[PDB]
Amino acid sequence: SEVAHRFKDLGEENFKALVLIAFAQYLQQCPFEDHVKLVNEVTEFAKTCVADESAENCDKSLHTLFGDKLCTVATLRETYGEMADCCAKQEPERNECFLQHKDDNPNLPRLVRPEVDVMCTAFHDNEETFLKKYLYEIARRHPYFYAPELLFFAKRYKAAFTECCQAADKAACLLPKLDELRDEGKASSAKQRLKCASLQKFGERAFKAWAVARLSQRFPKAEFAEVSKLVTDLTKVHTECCHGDLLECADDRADLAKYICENQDSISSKLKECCEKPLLEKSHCIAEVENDEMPADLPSLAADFVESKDVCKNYAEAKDVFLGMFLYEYARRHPDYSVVLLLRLAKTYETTLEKCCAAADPHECYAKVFDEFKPLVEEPQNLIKQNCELFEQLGEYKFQNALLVRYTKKVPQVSTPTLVEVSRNLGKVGSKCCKHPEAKRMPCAEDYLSVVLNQLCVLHEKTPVSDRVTKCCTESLVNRRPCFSALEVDETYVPKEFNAETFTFHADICTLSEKERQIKKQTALVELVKHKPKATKEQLKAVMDDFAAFVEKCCKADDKETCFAEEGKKLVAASQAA
Ligand SMILES: CCCC1C(=O)N2C(N(C)C)=Nc3ccc(C)cc3N2C1=O
Numbered sequence: 001s002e003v004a005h006r007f008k009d010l011g012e013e014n015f016k017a018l019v020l021i022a023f024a025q026y027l028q029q030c031p032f033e034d035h036v037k038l039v040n041e042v043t044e045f046a047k048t049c050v051a052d053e054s055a056e057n058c059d060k061s062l063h064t065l066f067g068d069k070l071c072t073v074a075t076l077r078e079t080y081g082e083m084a085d086c087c088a089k090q091e092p093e094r095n096e097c098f099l100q101h102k103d104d105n106p107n108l109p110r111l112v113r114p115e116v117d118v119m120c121t122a123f124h125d126n127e128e129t130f131l132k133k134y135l136y137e138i139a140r141r142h143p144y145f146y147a148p149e150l151l152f153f154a155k156r157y158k159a160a161f162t163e164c165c166q167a168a169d170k171a172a173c174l175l176p177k178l179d180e181l182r183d184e185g186k187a188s189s190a191k192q193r194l195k196c197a198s199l200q201k202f203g204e205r206a207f208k209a210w211a212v213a214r215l216s217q218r219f220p221k222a223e224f225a226e227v228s229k230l231v232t233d234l235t236k237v238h239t240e241c242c243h244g245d246l247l248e249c250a251d252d253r254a255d256l257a258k259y260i261c262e263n264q265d266s267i268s269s270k271l272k273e274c275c276e277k278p279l280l281e282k283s284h285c286i287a288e289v290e291n292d293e294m295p296a297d298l299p300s301l302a303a304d305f306v307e308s309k310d311v312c313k314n315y316a317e318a319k320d321v322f323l324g325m326f327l328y329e330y331a332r333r334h335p336d337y338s339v340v341l342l343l344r345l346a347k348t349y350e351t352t353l354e355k356c357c358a359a360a361d362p363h364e365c366y367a368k369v370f371d372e373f374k375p376l377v378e379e380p381q382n383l384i385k386q387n388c389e390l391f392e393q394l395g396e397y398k399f400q401n402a403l404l405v406r407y408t409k410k411v412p413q414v415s416t417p418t419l420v421e422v423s424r425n426l427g428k429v430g431s432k433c434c435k436h437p438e439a440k441r442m443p444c445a446e447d448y449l450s451v452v453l454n455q456l457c458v459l460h461e462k463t464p465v466s467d468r469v470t471k472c473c474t475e476s477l478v479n480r481r482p483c484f485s486a487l488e489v490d491e492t493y494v495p496k497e498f499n500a501e502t503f504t505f506h507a508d509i510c511t512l513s514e515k516e517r518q519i520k521k522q523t524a525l526v527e528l529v530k531h532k533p534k535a536t537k538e539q540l541k542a543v544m545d546d547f548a549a550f551v552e553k554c555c556k557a558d559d560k561e562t563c564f565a566e567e568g569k570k571l572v573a574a575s576q577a578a
């Protein structure tokens with residue numbers, strides 16, 4: 001039995017949660033209730049298997065079990081149409097079908113939160129249900145949310161209410177901590193989406209490379225044989241969490257933290273504090289631990305990678321181990337380099353050894369490789385230096401508008417909402433990284449841009465409308481950013497035509513939070529640039545300044561909401577003029 005296997009390892013609490021998240025992440029539309037039912041029916045079954053390890057079907061694979069349980073409600077196409085397909089299939093045909101149907105943008109209603117008085121009541125009255133509802137709302141909206149980590153956010157979430165509800169002003173104590181959590185989880189969720197896209201779209205070799213370079217930066221003192229050990233396991237973990245095998249992912253993830261803490265001295269000296277706490281907190285700590293100090297006397301890379309005469313021979317013997325080593329070596333001494341640049345260099349090196357080693361005199365040929373790294377290294381530095389300057393001058397909001405105009409011009413076919421979210425996140429790189437010293441700027445900026453551009457790539461993959469987004473997203477994982485930065489304006493885009501339904505206005509806007517207004521303002525700017533690409537940042541600007549005036553005004557006018565009827569036709573006259 002496997003269900004029994006995992007149960008004993010995780011226990012009732014975690015086992016019950018993971019299965020909830022797994023169910024929530026598969027049938028994102030189904031109601032909380034039904035998920036709970038199935039979870040319990042599933043948990044009960046497990047309990048018997050523990051005793052009699054051959055009872056009913058305790059001999060199967062989680063999937064068959066999990067799959068059939070969901071198929072007791074999925075067959076309801078009237079609710080989940082395209083799902084019935086999946087159930088008519090059989091493992092593994094069935095499982096893939098489910099994974100392939102997860103929605104990165106569910107049509108789930110916004111999740112507003114009741115007043116502090118209700119939450120604390122509901123929390124206090126019934127706890128487990130309160131926290132179950134939390135996991136369900138997160139897992140269903142983030143189908144790739146790294147499960148093990150979601151449990152950590154949960155324990156954290158619980159402590160928020162557990163303390164704040166006993167305050168002198170709950171609202172004051174809760175709100176903050178709740179906000180800080182909503183953000184941090186959106187970040188977690190995106191870093192994870194990239195890892196799964198990598199594994200799924202590009203293959204484990206690509207993820208392995210990513211990991212080697214990332215881990216080598218974090219643990220410079222660790223050894224190549226050691227890192228590789230870690231890279232092998234870590235890859236398996238994610239591979240499981242990204243294929244929907246949550247229980248094993250969680251299990252293996254625990255075993256990995258166990259190992260890493262045991263062999264502490266062999267890996268990093270900054271792990272101590274991590275290994276002295278509860279599992280869930282232990283794991284989250286290791287994954288976020290700062291890099292260890294760099295080993296003192298380190299030889300020059302040129303030694304064994306460009307000057308040695310045995311280069312090509314070693315490359316031929318174990319090209320993967322050789323390139324593996326080159327990356328580990330270059331990464332361990334460059335924590336000031338974003339992981340994607342390290343991978344670009346590694347690819348530039350591989351390409352060179354390929355053409356060079358089949359030459360009349362390899363050495364002569366590959367002797368100047370580092371001369372090419374110079375451009376690759378400076379491109380990002382200059383880009384960051386430039387973009388943080390602009391940011392510092394315009395502030396976040398204005399900087400995001402800039403990126404909005406700029407991207408809409410690159411890929412005008414992309415849907416306005418997607419362009420708005422992505423440009424807003426791209427501009428958050430300013431506040432997130434520009435306040436760093438150049439030594440830490442690049443890894444912060446350029447790797448964060450990979451996570452943001454991946455969203456666009458996955459949101460776009462649902463309904464592809466721009467081959468330029470497809471080219472840049474599918475050509476090379478590591479070069480995505482460089483690809484997009486090269487795009488200028490689409491010369492073949494045929495401008496749109498002003499609609500009435502292209503953009504509705506109904507006064508309902510004067511009630512929305514401040515943020516939700518800039519957003520409505522930004523959504524406008526996008527639609528503008530699509531209707532007038534060839535327009536300039538001069539006109540556009542002056543115009544944006546106008547719209548601000550319209551809202552600030554009419555939202556303070558006492559006529560029936562017809563000040564838009566009259567002034568709405570008024571602005572239209574001005575707009576067409578520009
Ligand atoms: C639009 C954002 C609404 C929103 C929100 O408030 N959330 C929240 N709460 C309830 C604190 N915690 C989260 C933690 C991690 C993630 C990924 C998402 C949320 N979650 C949301 O999606």
Ligand SMILES: CCCC1C(=O)N2C(N(C)C)=Nc3ccc(C)cc3N2C1=O
Nearest residue numbers: 146149214215230234256257286287288
């Ligand atoms: C960027 C950090 C590199 C990195 C790292 O050290 N990780 C790790 N261990 C314990 C090796 N376990 C994980 C668990 C959860 C998350 C979200 C990420 C990791 N994983 C990484 O992605």
